[PDB]
Design a protein around this ligand. Sequence first.
Ligand SMILES: [Cl-]
Ligand SMILES: [Cl-]
Ligand SMILES: [Cl-]
Ligand SMILES: [Cl-]
Length: 124
Amino acid sequence: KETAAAKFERQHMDSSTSAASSSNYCNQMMKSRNLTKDRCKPVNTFVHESLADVQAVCSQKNVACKNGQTNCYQSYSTMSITDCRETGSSKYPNCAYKTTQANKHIIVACEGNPYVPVHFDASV
Ligand SMILES: [Cl-]
Ligand SMILES: [Cl-]
Ligand SMILES: [Cl-]
Ligand SMILES: [Cl-]
C-alpha cells in the first residue's frame, strides 16, 4: 500500500535538521518514522538535504548498484547524512542505535515516472 517513492521518503529523508544533533538522534528518528514497529530495522540512513536535491541525484552519475542493477546514481557532491545502526545490545522491542553523522556522496536506485529515488544503496 505505501508506494516505493513514499517509503524512501519516510525511511530516509530528514530535511528538518542539517545534521544529527545528539547521540540519541537515531533512537528518536527510527521510532518516529515507524522503523522499530515490528522489529528493529538493523541499519538505516537519513539524508539532511532538501527533497529536491535528493531527487536530483537521479540525473547525476549513473553507477552500478551493489546488487548488479544499473539504475543507481551517485551524487556529484557530498551531502549531510546520519547512519543509524543497531548496537550489539539492541533487542526488539528495546531497539538501541548508534548515531554516526557524516558528509558524503549518496548512491540511490531510481525508478518510475517521475524518476525518483526508491532505494538507498550506500554512501561514499
Ligand atoms: Cl508517491
Ligand atoms: Cl508510517
Ligand atoms: Cl539505509
Ligand atoms: Cl531503501
